Each structure stands twice: as structure tokens, then as C-alpha cells.
Design a binder for this molecule. Structure first.
Ligand SMILES: CN(C)C(=O)Nc1ccc(Cl)c(Cl)c1
Ligand SMILES: CN(C)C(=O)Nc1ccc(Cl)c(Cl)c1
Lengths: 313, 314
């Protein structure tokens, strides 16, 4: 309510919500899973004070944005085309796209398929992986044992039941520092699911407060986890769309920000990205887990502003 | 509306302001008049955005999707201006160019007077800047010129509301007309019954508007009615008292005064000697242009606004 709330209808059933702060070049912030525009809480005033027009999104299936139950509505192709329509209705020819996690995956696809609409691209934790035309996306998940949670997120209604059971428990178990993390994502089920080692009433992490956790709880009461989980349920569709580009390079200015303690989106996954992205710049945050914006907000703000002032402007 | 980006800012616990947003560049805040909408800037919105400006076309307090409290005090220039400051604060805008028409034009002058640090540049269509006379009554100023008789008719709450809400399609078809098509006789609102006495039950469509454009204003005014819009007129003494607190000071920021040759209420002669109080004042004049400036001559408005923005606001 201290924020300016924007609403853009991209499709007759799809309406995208965003918070707006500041003046200057348009900066579109895209959150990950299971997040909110609120994940960019420390970045919003910092980027606006630096001289940028901040557009922090509530991604499709999250918060005040439309959440259709259809799985097909959450493929990279549909999501990217909606983001282009979002820019068109706002009268923006270009925008700087900064994404984290699943938002980071979206921003790379936006830079690859629509470079004329992306002034500059930045990604927190998520690397740019060029699709292998000879290897199946299911084979890539099963190769590394750490991605076992993704297979558990495939069947609709299964992960939804566990994540919606107790919202306060869900966010308190997920939004933790790496040394405070008790998640065993490498071996999901036996029965317990994602939160087996986590207790019924988990302790509050050093990054978040009770008020911050309760904000995500209220937001996820509106639509649940179906929409957010459907982002994982389009692995074959996204692989086929990424194969359509093949060989082409992202020529626009780019930033890759790696997190030292992110065990799922490891910094080593970002290697050789400069071969596919010639104008790639690098950022690295030590003592930083998966929840980059929450874990090290000061380091994120400094890295983003420095790059925006030199490469995006 | 469905093709537009819709923004919402809660300025007070009971007051929420709606706006349409288009383009990138310096922030340009468009403020409509009475009994209008953000839609009155329909020709200006894509034109200023294409010219390289971030357009914020307001639904003023008491109109459309914006909050409409029944209280008269909520529509005085003091409350309205403070809410616009809060609107800029929550959007993270240090400054914005303020372009107003009619009652919105009055707002932009007060915004430039009391808050010049938040106004990059000020522009007004038809509405002049008149410094309040401390030794002259506000009620006597309206009674001096016979043309402002309709304002006295707009004072009693519920009276004008009943006539304006009776038939919304008839209301907008009788008001939104060119000067040569105008059937209104606002100088004698006492002898006859209402404002639309000379107008027929089913008035003809004006050369400036289409049937679908008239239908938009009808749908918008079904939400809150005419109480909120008419309360802008019911704060004459309160607005005069606030204007007297500034007395002596000049508007030092860049300014533009756009006069309309055929506006019989906000006559171009009312804008005379404005440069004495506004040193950096620029001028614009549209011939064959009635009260509904944006509606009447859209191409002329766009050209005058773009030329002034590129030279005085940048
Ligand atoms: C494919 N991607 C980006 C993910 O699976 N990200 C992701 C998001 C949330 C969590 Cl809790 C985990 Cl372990 C990974
Ligand atoms: C004090 N002002 C600006 C007005 O009374 N403006 C105004 C608005 C609408 C109409 Cl129909 C008329 Cl006659 C005057």
C-alpha cells in the first residue's frame, strides 16, 4: 500500500501485476519459485534511488497476477510473448530485464528470442544453458542426483498438497541461509516429501523476520502452488523452443551473477557462457545461498547498480 | 481501457487514485477537468508517449476508478494538491511535468505555486492563473460576471446531481459539443429548470465525438455519479483562503498557458498580465477551439504540448 500498483491485461484471462517505483530507464525485475515481487524489497528503493524506473513483477501464477490451472500456460514461449505484450501496452520499446531463479531462465529466453525489446539482461544464480538437440531434457535432470525435487514437482496435485498444507512452515523451511538449510532435495520421497528433516514449527532464519514470512503466506492464499509449480511442468516444450534458435548468440549487454552457496544453481553451471554471449559481464557473491536478494541484499544492489550505470545506460 | 496499463496509488486511508500509463522518459502528469475522465486525454496519451515521454493520465479524485468520498472538504485545492504530492512520493518521482485542463488546470497552477520543487514544468489548457484578492469576496467575483451563474447552481448538494445523473447519455451529448453546436445558456440558470433546458431529450451527436466515446463517459460516471466531481466547485472560500497564504510570491518554474478562442467561460482575455506573476511563461492559442480543448482540436494540442516539452521541460 506504500507502493504504486500496476495492472496489464496481456490475454483475455491473463492480467499481470507489478509494483512501480522511480524514474529513468525501465528495469523489469522477475522473481523465482516460490516467490513474489516482495523478493526484490531491498532492490526496489536502491535501484530507484540510483536513477531507474523499477517494475517489480508478480510473475504468472503468483500474488495479484492471473493464475490459470492449465500447465501449457506456464511454458517459456507463452510467458515470454506475454512479457512482450506487457511492454507494448505500457508503451515501452525496451526494458532492462533482471531475473532470479525461474525469472532468470525467463530473462535469458527474453534476451535470446526478443533482443530488440531487452536493453540489457541480468541473471541471479540462473545460467544460460544452450539446448542439446541430441539429449532429452528428462535425461539431464536424472544425470545429476541434486535435481530429484524437479521430478517430484512433475505430478499435479502432489507437491501442491505438501506446499499448501502449512504456508508458515513452507516459507520458513525454504527461505533459509545455506548453513541453516535442512532440505534433502537430492533424495525426495519416502512419504515425507520436500520437508522431512524440517520440524512442524521451524525456526526463523537470520535473513527473514516474522512479518516478511507472513507476507508470502497471505500472497499464496489467493491462488496456491498450482501456477508456480506449472513452471517446472514444461521441460519438453521449453527444450523444443530453445532448439529452434540453435547457434545464434545473445549480442545485447549481459550480467551473470553467481551465488557461492547455491547448491542447485551452482556457479560451475555458468562456465563457457561467454562463447554464446560475447558481451557477458560477471558478478560473484560469497557466503550467498539460493535466496540471493534476501541473503546478500547490499552485494546484489552494488553489483546491479554498477553494471546498470556502465552497460545498460 | 483494456489496451491500457492501469496504475493505482493509495494516497490516504480512504483515498486511492487511478491512472493510465504509457511511454518512457520524463514523467508527464495529465489532469482532466469537469465532468471529465483520463479518456479526455485519448489523443494526447499516444502522441506524448511517441514524442519520448512517460504519460500518467489521471482519473482525478471523485472520477472513474479513483476514490469518491461524499465530503465537500475532500475536494478543496489544499487536500487535492497534498494527495498529488503523496502520489509522486509513492511512485518514487521527485518531479513530474503537470499538464491540466479546466479544474485540473486550476490544480496544476496551485501545484506549481505551493510545490514548485515537485513540478518540473507546468501547462494549462483554458484555465488561467489568477492571484487571490485579499480585499474581495469569492462569491462577489462569480456574481460580477453573468456567465458564471451555473457555478451558483452547482453549490447546493443534490440539486445539480439529480439533473446530471437523470440521463447520462443526454448529459455528455449536451456538454461535449463544439461552441457553434452548443445549446447551453449558463448565464441564466434561475428562470428556467436546469442546465439542459434548450437541449432536447435525445440530442444530436457532436462533430468531435463518436457514439462509443460518449458511451465510455456514461459507463465511468455510473460508478460514483456527480457528487465528487461537483464538490470541486463547493470549496470557493476555502480555496481563496489557501491562495491568500502564498500572496506576493511568483511561479519561477517553466510554464505554458494555452488559450482557446471559443471557450466562453474560460475566455483568453482572463489570462492577461499572467507574465507579471509567472516570469518564465510561454504562450499558446488555438483558434476555432471551444471549452473541450483536447476533444475539439487534438492535433493542435499535441503540437503545442510536444514543442513546449522538448524546449522548456527537458
Ligand atoms: C530450474 N530451477 C531454476 C530450480 O529448480 N530452482 C529452484 C527453486 C526453488 C528451490 Cl527450493 C530449488 Cl531447490 C530450486
Ligand atoms: C471554474 N471552472 C474551470 C469551470 O467552471 N469550468 C467549467 C467546466 C464545465 C463547464 Cl460545462 C463549464 Cl460551463 C465550466
Amino acid at each position: 500500500s506504500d507502493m504504486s500498483h500496476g495492472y496489464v491485461t496481456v490475454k483475455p484471462r491473463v492480467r499481470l501485476h507489478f509494483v512501480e517505483l522511480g524514474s529513468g530507464p525501465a528495469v523489469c525485475l522477475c522473481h523465482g519459485f516460490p516467490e513474489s515481487w516482495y523478493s526484490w524489497r531491498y532492490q526496489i528503493p536502491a535501484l530507484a534511488q540510483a536513477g531507474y524506473r523499477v517494475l517489480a513483477m508478480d510473475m504468472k501464477g503468483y500474488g495479484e497476477s492471473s493464475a490459470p490451472p492449465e500447465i501449457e500456460e506456464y511454458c517459456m514461449e507463452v510467458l515470454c510473448k506475454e512479457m512482450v505484450t506487457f511492454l507494448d501496452k505500457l508503451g515501452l520499446s525496451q526494458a532492462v530485464f533482471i531475473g532470479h531463479d525461474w525469472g532468470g531462465m525467463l530473462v535469458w529466453y527474453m534476451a535470446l528470442f526478443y533482443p530488440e525489446r531487452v536493453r540489457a539482461v541480468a541473471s541471479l544464480n540462473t545460467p544460460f544453458i544452450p539446448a542439446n538437440p541430441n539429449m532429452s531434457p528428462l535425461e539431464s535432470i536424472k544425470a545429476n542426483p541434486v535435481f530429484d525435487y524437479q521430478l517430484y514437482f512433475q505430478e499435479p496435485g502432489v507437491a501442491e498438497a505438501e506446499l499448501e498444507q502449512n504456508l508458515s512452515r513452507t516459507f520458513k523451511s525454504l527461505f533459509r541461509a545455506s548453513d541453516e538449510s535442512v532440505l534433502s532435495m537430492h533424495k525426495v520421497c519416502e512419504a515425507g516429501g520436500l520437508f522431512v528433516n524440517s520440524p512442524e514449527e521451524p525456526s526463523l532464519s537470520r535473513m527473514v523476520t516474522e512479518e516478511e514470512i507472513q507476507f508470502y503466506v497471505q500472497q499464496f492464499k489467493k491462488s496456491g502452488f498450482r501456477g508456480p509449480l506449472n513452471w517446472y511442468r514444461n521441460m519438453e516444450r521449453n527444450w523444443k523452443w530453445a532448439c529452434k534458435s540453435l547457434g545464434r548468440k545473445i549480442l545485447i549487454p549481459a550480467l551473470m551473477v553467481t551465488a557461492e552457496k547455491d547448491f542447485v544453481l551452482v556457479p560451475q553451471m555458468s562456465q563457457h557462457m561467454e562463447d554464446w554471449i560475447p558481451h557477458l559481464k560477471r558478478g560473484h557473491i560469497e557466503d550467498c545461498g539460493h535466496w540471493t536478494q534476501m541473503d546478500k541484499p547490499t552485494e546484489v544492489n552494488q553489483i546491479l547498480i554498477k553494471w546498470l550505470d556502465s552497460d545498460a545506460r
